[PDB]
Amino acid sequence: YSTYTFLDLNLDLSKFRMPQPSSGRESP
Amino acid sequence: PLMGWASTADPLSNLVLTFSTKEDAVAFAEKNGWSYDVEERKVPKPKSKSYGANFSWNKRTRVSTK
Amino acid sequence: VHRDTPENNPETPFDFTPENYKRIEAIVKNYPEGHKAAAVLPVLDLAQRQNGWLPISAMNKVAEILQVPPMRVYEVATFYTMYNRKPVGKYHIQVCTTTPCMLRNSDSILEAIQKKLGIKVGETTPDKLFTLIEVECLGACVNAPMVQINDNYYEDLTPKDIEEIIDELKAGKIPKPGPRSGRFSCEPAGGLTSLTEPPKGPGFGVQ
Amino acid sequence: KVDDAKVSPPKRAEMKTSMESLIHHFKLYTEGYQVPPGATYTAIEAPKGEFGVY
Amino acid sequence: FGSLKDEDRIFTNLYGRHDWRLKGAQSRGDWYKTKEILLKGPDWILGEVKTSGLRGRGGAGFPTGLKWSFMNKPSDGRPKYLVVNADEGEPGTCKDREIIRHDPHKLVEGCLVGGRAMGARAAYIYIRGEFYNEASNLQVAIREAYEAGLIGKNACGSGYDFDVFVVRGAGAYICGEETALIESIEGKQGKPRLKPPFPADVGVFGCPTTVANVETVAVSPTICRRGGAWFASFGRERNSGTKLFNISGHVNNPCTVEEEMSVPLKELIEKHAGGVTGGWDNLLAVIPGGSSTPLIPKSVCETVLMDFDALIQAQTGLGTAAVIVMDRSTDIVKAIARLIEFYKHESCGQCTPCREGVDWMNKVMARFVRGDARPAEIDSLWEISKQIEGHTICALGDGAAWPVQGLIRHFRPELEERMQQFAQQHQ
Amino acid sequence: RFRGEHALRRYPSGEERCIACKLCEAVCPAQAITIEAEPRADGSRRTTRYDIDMTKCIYCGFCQEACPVDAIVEGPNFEFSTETHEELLYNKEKLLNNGDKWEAEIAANIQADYLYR
Amino acid sequence: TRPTVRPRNDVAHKQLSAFGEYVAEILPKYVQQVQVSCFNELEICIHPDGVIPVLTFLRDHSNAQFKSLADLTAVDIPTRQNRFEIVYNLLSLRFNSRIRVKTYTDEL
Amino acid sequence: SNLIEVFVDGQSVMVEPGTTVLQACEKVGMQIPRFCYHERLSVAGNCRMCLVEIEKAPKVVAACAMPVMKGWNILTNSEKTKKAREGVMEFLLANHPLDCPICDQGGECDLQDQSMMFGSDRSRFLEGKRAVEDKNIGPLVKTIMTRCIQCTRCIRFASEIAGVDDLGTTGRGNDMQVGTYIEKMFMSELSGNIIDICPVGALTSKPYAFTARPWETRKTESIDVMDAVG
Numbered sequence A: 001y002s003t004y005t006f007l008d009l010n011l012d013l014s015k016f017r018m019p020q021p022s023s024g025r026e027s028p
Numbered sequence B: 001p002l003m004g005w006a007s008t009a010d011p012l013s014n015l016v017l018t019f020s021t022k023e024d025a026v027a028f029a030e031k032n033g034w035s036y037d038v039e040e041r042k043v044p045k046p047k048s049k050s051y052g053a054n055f056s057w058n059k060r061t062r063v064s065t066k
Numbered sequence C: 001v002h003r004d005t006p007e008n009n010p011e012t013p014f015d016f017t018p019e020n021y022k023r024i025e026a027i028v029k030n031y032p033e034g035h036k037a038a039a040v041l042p043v044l045d046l047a048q049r050q051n052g053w054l055p056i057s058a059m060n061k062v063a064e065i066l067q068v069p070p071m072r073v074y075e076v077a078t079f080y081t082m083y084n085r086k087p088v089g090k091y092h093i094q095v096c097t098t099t100p101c102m103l104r105n106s107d108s109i110l111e112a113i114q115k116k117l118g119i120k121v122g123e124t125t126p127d128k129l130f131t132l133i134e135v136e137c138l139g140a141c142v143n144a145p146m147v148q149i150n151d152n153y154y155e156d157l158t159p160k161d162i163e164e165i166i167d168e169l170k171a172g173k174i175p176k177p178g179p180r181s182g183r184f185s186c187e188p189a190g191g192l193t194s195l196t197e198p199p200k201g202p203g204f205g206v207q
Numbered sequence D: 001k002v003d004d005a006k007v008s009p010p011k012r013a014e015m016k017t018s019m020e021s022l023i024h025h026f027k028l029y030t031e032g033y034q035v036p037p038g039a040t041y042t043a044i045e046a047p048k049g050e051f052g053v054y
Numbered sequence E: 001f002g003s004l005k006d007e008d009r010i011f012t013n014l015y016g017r018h019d020w021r022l023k024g025a026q027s028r029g030d031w032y033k034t035k036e037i038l039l040k041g042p043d044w045i046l047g048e049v050k051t052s053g054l055r056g057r058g059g060a061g062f063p064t065g066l067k068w069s070f071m072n073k074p075s076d077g078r079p080k081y082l083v084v085n086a087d088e089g090e091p092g093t094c095k096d097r098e099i100i101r102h103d104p105h106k107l108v109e110g111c112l113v114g115g116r117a118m119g120a121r122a123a124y125i126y127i128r129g130e131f132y133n134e135a136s137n138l139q140v141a142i143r144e145a146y147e148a149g150l151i152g153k154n155a156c157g158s159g160y161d162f163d164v165f166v167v168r169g170a171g172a173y174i175c176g177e178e179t180a181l182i183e184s185i186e187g188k189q190g191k192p193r194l195k196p197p198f199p200a201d202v203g204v205f206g207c208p209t210t211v212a213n214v215e216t217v218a219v220s221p222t223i224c225r226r227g228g229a230w231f232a233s234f235g236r237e238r239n240s241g242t243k244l245f246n247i248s249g250h251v252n253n254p255c256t257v258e259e260e261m262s263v264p265l266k267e268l269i270e271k272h273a274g275g276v277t278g279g280w281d282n283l284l285a286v287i288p289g290g291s292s293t294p295l296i297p298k299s300v301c302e303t304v305l306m307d308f309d310a311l312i313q314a315q316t317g318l319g320t321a322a323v324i325v326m327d328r329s330t331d332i333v334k335a336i337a338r339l340i341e342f343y344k345h346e347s348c349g350q351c352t353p354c355r356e357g358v359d360w361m362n363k364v365m366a367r368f369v370r371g372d373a374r375p376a377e378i379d380s381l382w383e384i385s386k387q388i389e390g391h392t393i394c395a396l397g398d399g400a401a402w403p404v405q406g407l408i409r410h411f412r413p414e415l416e417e418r419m420q421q422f423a424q425q426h427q
Numbered sequence F: 001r002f003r004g005e006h007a008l009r010r011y012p013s014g015e016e017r018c019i020a021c022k023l024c025e026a027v028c029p030a031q032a033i034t035i036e037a038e039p040r041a042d043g044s045r046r047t048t049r050y051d052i053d054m055t056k057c058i059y060c061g062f063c064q065e066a067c068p069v070d071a072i073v074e075g076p077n078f079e080f081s082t083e084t085h086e087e088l089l090y091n092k093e094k095l096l097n098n099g100d101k102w103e104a105e106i107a108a109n110i111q112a113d114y115l116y117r
Numbered sequence G: 001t002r003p004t005v006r007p008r009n010d011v012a013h014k015q016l017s018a019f020g021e022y023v024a025e026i027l028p029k030y031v032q033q034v035q036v037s038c039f040n041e042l043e044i045c046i047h048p049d050g051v052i053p054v055l056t057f058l059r060d061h062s063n064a065q066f067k068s069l070a071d072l073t074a075v076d077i078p079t080r081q082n083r084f085e086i087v088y089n090l091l092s093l094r095f096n097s098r099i100r101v102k103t104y105t106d107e108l
Numbered sequence H: 001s002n003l004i005e006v007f008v009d010g011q012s013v014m015v016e017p018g019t020t021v022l023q024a025c026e027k028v029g030m031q032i033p034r035f036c037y038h039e040r041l042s043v044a045g046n047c048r049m050c051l052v053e054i055e056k057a058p059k060v061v062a063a064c065a066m067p068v069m070k071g072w073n074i075l076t077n078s079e080k081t082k083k084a085r086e087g088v089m090e091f092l093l094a095n096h097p098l099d100c101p102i103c104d105q106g107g108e109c110d111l112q113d114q115s116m117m118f119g120s121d122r123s124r125f126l127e128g129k130r131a132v133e134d135k136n137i138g139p140l141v142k143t144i145m146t147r148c149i150q151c152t153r154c155i156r157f158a159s160e161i162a163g164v165d166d167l168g169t170t171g172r173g174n175d176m177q178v179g180t181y182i183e184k185m186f187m188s189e190l191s192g193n194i195i196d197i198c199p200v201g202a203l204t205s206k207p208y209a210f211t212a213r214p215w216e217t218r219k220t221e222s223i224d225v226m227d228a229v230g
Ligand SMILES: Cc1cc2nc3c(=O)[nH]c(=O)nc-3n(C[C@H](O)[C@H](O)[C@H](O)COP(=O)(O)O)c2cc1C
Pocket: E055, E056, E057, E058, E059, E060, E061, E062, E064, E085, E086, E087, E088, E089, E090, E175, E176, E177, E178, E211, E212, E213, E216, E291, E292, E395, E399
């Protein structure tokens, strides 16, 4: 019910814990 | 020099024969007795192609834009 | 319509807000590095969120962010439906016409919008902001021919809503983001109650 | 004409609307047909004798 | 089938619609026995869904208990991921945005539980961009529990605990098929791969993944929880369990519907609650599914239950679980012609069978709705529908023959009288 | 349907109906036609030289029926009998003159007979 | 198959099969290949020493007259290791049948 | 050692575990009709013009891109193959202009040397034929993108060898074009070499453009000297 305010979704608490990332490499 | 028709002597100029093999190729230039020069048959690489190798984890072949 | 650019604005320009650059940090952290390489679906759509409709100079900008060739981005922005390249309005309205919505009496939620408004059908308003399109396949055909807006949707449509939602937004109101009448909770109506209780002894996982 | 169009050319009012008709009008006039191998012989009654083709 | 039911009760696999839709404390159903479920190994859950043999609610068979255990390579050196669908691409489905409406806590209950069966690393769920308010509350529903230390990265009590990474498309295609979603999860244009390369659990994002549906994993907590000897509840020994329905088209209350296997549609559609059109002596021409099912008249389908083979006993079965009718006022040809018009505006464009075969039809299907000159084009239009089956890659080739191929069946005086009217009018 | 002198028609107000598509030269059995095209400056392609011998011309009717754009037509006038072999070679700019000395003659013929072929 | 495709018959395809079966059975000094043409005609390959006798066997007999020589022809073929190809052709006036005699050769 | 004995048309042949149906059937001397597959490129499956009816199966597969398992019966000429090749190649010859008087690949084009040999006999559309517009790329390559069977063969060239990533696939459904979205010119070395690749008359030569049809030329092989490798 708000068109903006995606930083509450995206990077608010999901930046503190990602987790972790390790995610491998794949450089390539 | 009246039209532009590419007129000519050289009465052979249009002769292709179709021989089945090399073994019976040179066996006709000798029986009538003129010189020759032989090319070679070329057949390509066998080769290694595999769809599904276009998607990699660490390799370099990875295509896009499709 | 066409999908080409006859050089309106090659350099518009369109640069981002320093509040927006730190949100680009969070997206790249999600994807695994190396094959990260394209976060173009939130990154280009974040450029739509700042502007409203993105010109060709916005498409050249994100290529320098993600070190991709530019044609990798011109391609992707012209496939998906939601992105906008022509100029748009303040309220981009969607009348969800499909087969069951045709059966759900879209006929009065059809024109008589233009008799209510005064524009051409399927067309933007001549002045500024009302721009009318029609879309397919969003959720409930169990409702009426529902009308989505840029942040919500309006279930249970009717010509009285056509007499309201068109009317109240010209003054700038919020015409009920939900079902304006009927069941507020989308219930079976004759099967709605079903004796609300704890769900009959949790704990069968002994096995 | 024989109908199956790999032997007959099509009508002039047919090679002028549809697409599949040029490809069998054009290419039936650059190269000819394709006929399978093998010899044959025949004979009709020409009005003084025969007329045979090998 | 048993006793022709398929009832509706309160002992269900859903929590509740009207109770509470926001964040909460996971009152009775959610997180009841949390760590004891995943305390055991994978083979405790591998083959455990064979007590139901849950076929899968994506739109096909191939049971979801089998795709997780079997067709699942153990490991070589590379990670694994989960891809949970949430896109609803069949028109008039509404099976999603009702699960996400009031019960969002249940989806992360079996996200970590379902991924233990594969042993995958991360979880990528995929919501349509157009559903933005409900998907906004989904990320809020993460922080209610996941942020509270219940899940990740070692919570609770196990070394296996991971995240959920939410993305959005825009207006995409990848609902109706996999292998276009794992392409559009990258950034490419979503023009899908071939479906058997090396199929979707061999070649994926960079490393093999799985593709499941919403209630393919939303029922997975309670199906591993309640189990039984209840998981075979209704229907025959072919299909087992209870599946979510929806009622659309012409009704007094087009509403959400919950039931179990093999209920007859004559007593099911009239119930909950009004059948406001002609229940009888009108047509009540019904469609079994969303878009992969053609028309049926008032014949034996009203006597036929909702088993998978019951509709396969008829000409076409369906797994979308969407019901739409048109009794009296609606023109029969007019409604389905705008469903062929639909496919021109979603189709990919790679294969020359689908592209430039649908538009062969959409140019001429709009002629039949008008009523025009001489027939016997119908059998030609029937042959073209008979000529897109194994030719296209994805199901939308196969999902574009079927509303044509059944309209040509079942219905003789459809346009034999309509084109007669224009032939009489021109005369 | 008579066969005779050659011609090249043109459209209402002139376009030189030929397009140099090279079929009237590939099914002459006697190899009379000799076409050499060039991209003309406007962009549409045309001929430069067009040569029909009137001695190798065996009078088939294979040029008349191979043409897609309906240009080269065996016209219905047997008026001939020149006195030099240097003359019966035709150029392009003879045929047009010979094809615009009449088109009231030719276009009355083809309108009667295009309904069969 | 359809109209505008030639209808065959198995009558002459069996009789001309069966007839020239024993032209290789009773002169197996010369005849070295016999094959049946699909359009109901016969070819019979004959070594060039049997140029006179297998004609002379045919020329008069009770079972195979073949008393009319329709066409003698000759085809040249490079790449054969023996160039030419002499092809005889005959007509059974009592019987309405055809048979061709294909004798290979060389220049010298 | 390390081969699968696979029976083509009821006749054995021994291929490596990991070849294609295309190459294996090209070993015993047969050419399935090819559009979207050139040897020196990658492999895509986006025209569906090789359709082999594999024996003892309901479905029909593409012989371009699939492995060959334990010994199949690759049944090329049947009554289900020949109902598919004839059905695919009526589709693309619909949305297509009526050239070959003036299109410059009038001698070799593979909507023409299939469609006598394989493919249909007559047309049933009977009106339509969408018409996109052309543009320019360079003064080497005349570009008429009306013709365009959309085989994506020129696009996989650029992402491959001639590493200028410039062309793309722009659109959805029937509405797509091929050429560059911006008005960028595409020019490097090997830039004019695409006009051999292009299997119909879309990409054609600019200086040669309207001179002569290719059944008249006299091919004599030769070696060119402007450079090191010859
Ligand atoms: C007509 C049709 C519509 C479909 N719609 C959807 C859809 O809206 N959402 C979805 O996830 N899958 C849809 N699918 C099927 C996908 O292929 C499916 O999601 C994928 O195969 C996973 O299936 P699963 O549930 O067995 O995991 C549809 C299939 C068909 C034939």
